[PDB]
Amino acid sequence: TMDKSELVQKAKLAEQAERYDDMAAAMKAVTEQGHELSNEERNLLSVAYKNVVGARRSSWRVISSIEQKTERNEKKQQMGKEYREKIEAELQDICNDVLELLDKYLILNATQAESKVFYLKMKGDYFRYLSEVASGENKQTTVSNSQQAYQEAFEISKKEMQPTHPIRLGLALNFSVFYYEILNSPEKACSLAKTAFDEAIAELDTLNEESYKDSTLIMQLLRDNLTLWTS
């Protein structure tokens, strides 16, 4: 087969060719080799699966929007329903692959607290995606696991990272989104976003050369979500 360096280069080609399923397959192999990922590799894996799952989430939203309209012929409404179920199946397979990686290889072996937080946030994200399409009893499971991952990441990050750290900020972003869209708690969502942005503003001196751009960007996303939500 191929070695780690070869797999990573293949992943970069795939990314440029916009072949994200290929990319995810390569980064999956690398991860399964069992060794801790460099920042580069870690980012490659994240991007790959974000795009793979992203395509399916987008398709699911389109089909659902369409599913909202009276359709006398039961075979059209029903047709679209079965198609939606297909998409949900693909989606669950992807998310379950990611969560498998996170539990077998990535989180347990994470040395730096930054890496730990990154992987736990990833786990929260993918359980959240499952939640977006999950059903009755399964939905409870999915939502709980999401919140647990987000909560652990959040505590670790408040203890170990600076409020301007992009990983910490993005964690806050996604977690607030979780409260708003998943737990339907607009109040707590806004509270979390506002607190995060405010703490980041208080300590602008903690910014550094390597990530000040990503920091300010995410702060912007936080404030944007805030405005969109408060109404």
């Binding site: 939203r61 659902s64 929007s65 909202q68 989104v177 708003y180 869209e181 960007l217 912007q220 996303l221 944007d224 979500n225 969109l228 939500w229």
Partner: peptide
């Protein structure tokens, strides 16, 4: 950078329109 912001905006707005209504 503003494209990231626009994508984000659209993705949140979608939930606001289709899941809240």
């Amino acid at each position: 950078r503003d494209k990231i912001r626009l994508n984000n905006a659209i993705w949140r707005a979608w939930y606001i329109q289709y899941v809240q209504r």
